Amino acid sequence: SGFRKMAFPSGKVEGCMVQVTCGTTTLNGLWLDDVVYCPRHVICTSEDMLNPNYEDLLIRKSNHNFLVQAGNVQLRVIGHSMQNCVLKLKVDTANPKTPKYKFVRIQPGQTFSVLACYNGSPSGVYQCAMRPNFTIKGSFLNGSCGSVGFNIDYDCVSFCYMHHMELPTGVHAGTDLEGNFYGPFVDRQTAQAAGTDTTITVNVLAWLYAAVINGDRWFLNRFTTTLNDFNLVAMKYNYEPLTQDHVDILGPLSAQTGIAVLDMCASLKELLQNGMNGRTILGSALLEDEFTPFDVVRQCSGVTF
C-alpha cells in the first residue's frame, strides 16, 4: 500500500493566514474569530532583536500602528495585548472562514503539520515532529514567522505551534498559541543552546510496525528482550527510555501484526548494534522517528476528515 510522510489537508488553515505589518517588519498572522495572533517580535526593528524590552517597545505602539491584511482587504485593529510571546490584535471583523479550532500544547515526540507562509500567503505544507529538545527540523526562510503547526481531528483544527526564530545551529524554535515557548528559548537574537537531541523510541517502533504491514520484514529477528535491558541499549545510542505507557500505545500495532512489543524492541536492539548493513526499510537507510503510533494507524486505515 506504500508509506509516505503525510500532512493534513491545509484547506482549513489557509483561510486563516493573514499578513501583519508593524513599521517595517512584516510577518504572518493567524486570524480566528475577531483576534489576530502573531509573534510579538513584529514590533522590533533589526537592531531591536539583540536585547528587546517588549513591555517598553509595545508601549510606544498604538492600535493604528498595526497593518493587518487578509488578501487585499484591510482589517481594523481596535485592541492589542501581549500574552507571553504572542501578540493578540483584536479586529472589528470576525473571520468568516473560521473553522472549529482549539489551542493545544503538544508533548515532545508528537507530530503536526506545518503550513509555511510568507507575506500571509501559504507556500507549502509538510509533516514534522517536536524533537525531545523542543526544537523542530523544518523548512523556514526569512518571513516565515507566524506560520502555524496544527493537527486535524475530523472537523476540529488543533493549533499547537507558531514559528518564531531560527537558531544559529539551523534548527527552529517557537511557541504554542498562548505564547509559551517550547523549551528554554526566548525571542531574542542571541546564542541559545538547544541541548542534546535524542531519538523518539516509541516513534521508531511504530515505524517498524508500519514496515511489517507493508511487507518489509527482513529486520525481524529471533530474540526477545526485557524493558530494563532494552532501555540500556537505548540510553547508549541516544534513544528515549521506553516506558509501559509507550508499550500500551503500541498495542493495536502489536495485535495487527502479531508481533509482541518486547520482540519488536529486540529487533530494534539488533539494528542499533549491527546497523542496516546497506539495506533499506520503507525506502529509508536510517531509523525514522517522525511517525507516532497514531500516525501509523491513520495511514494504514485511511482516516479522513
Add this chain to the structure above:
Amino acid sequence: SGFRKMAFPSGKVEGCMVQVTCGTTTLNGLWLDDVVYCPRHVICTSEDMLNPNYEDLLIRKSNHNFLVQAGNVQLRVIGHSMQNCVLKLKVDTANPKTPKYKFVRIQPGQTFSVLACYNGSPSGVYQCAMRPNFTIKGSFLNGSCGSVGFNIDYDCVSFCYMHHMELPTGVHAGTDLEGNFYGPFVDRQTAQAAGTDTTITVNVLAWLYAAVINGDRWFLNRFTTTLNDFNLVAMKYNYEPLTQDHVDILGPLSAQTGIAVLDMCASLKELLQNGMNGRTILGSALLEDEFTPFDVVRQCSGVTF
C-alpha cells in the same frame, strides 16, 4: 534554513473532491465546472475487473445509475461519456468552488502533490514524483481511486494525475485527466510489468545543490568530469543519461552556489562509486531524486501562491 519534502497547499483541491457511487463500487471524483471526473472502473464489479469490456459495461448504465455526493448534497447526473479510461459525468450544477485550472500531462521525473481521498473526503497530502517507468511510490489504500495529483502556479491548479490501480508489486499506476494511462498499463486486474526503474539524475544533482545551500558541503570533491564519461557511470548504476537540457535547467543552481554542473557530476560520480561511508546529506543516508530543480529553487526562495 532546512530542507523538507513539501507539498502545495491543498485548499483549492479539497473543494473539488466528491464521492461517486455506481452500484456497489464507491470511489472519489473530481468536480470542476459542471463535469465530474472519475476512473471508469467504478462501473465494474469485483468480478468484472478481471477482463472488463468497458464499452459493453457502460452501455448497461444510465444517468440515474451514478450517485455523486459533494458532502451531504446530491448532484443530478444529466450526461455521461467515456474518454479513454476516465468517466465524465455531466452534472446540472457548476462547482461554486472551482479554481482556475488546466489539464496537463507531465513528463517522467517531474513532481506533483497528491491529495489522498477516501469516500470523497480528503485524508492527507504528500509530494511524489513520476518515476521514469511511469509509476509512483505513493500511499494508497482501498478506495483511494479518484485521488488526483496536481501542481499550483500562483492561482492556477494544474491537474496531472488520477490514481486508478495498485500493481501487484505494490507501486501505483494511473492516468492524466484525459484518461490516458502513464505507461503501458491498463485498467484490468492482471499481472503487469512496470519495467526497470531508474534514478532521475537531474533531480539528484538539484538535491545536491540544495545541500550546499543549506551548508552540507562534505561531498564536494576536487575533480571534474565530461558529459560522456559521467553518463557512463550513470548507466552502470541505473541512472538517467544526463543531457545538455538537464545542464541548462541546473543553471541557476550552478550560479547561486558557484559550482559548475560538470563539477557537481564529478562529486556525484564519486558518491556512486564510493557510497556515503555512513554519512548523511540533508538528513538522508541515500541519494534523493524526488526534487526537481524547480522544487529546489521554490523552497530556497519562498515561492507562494
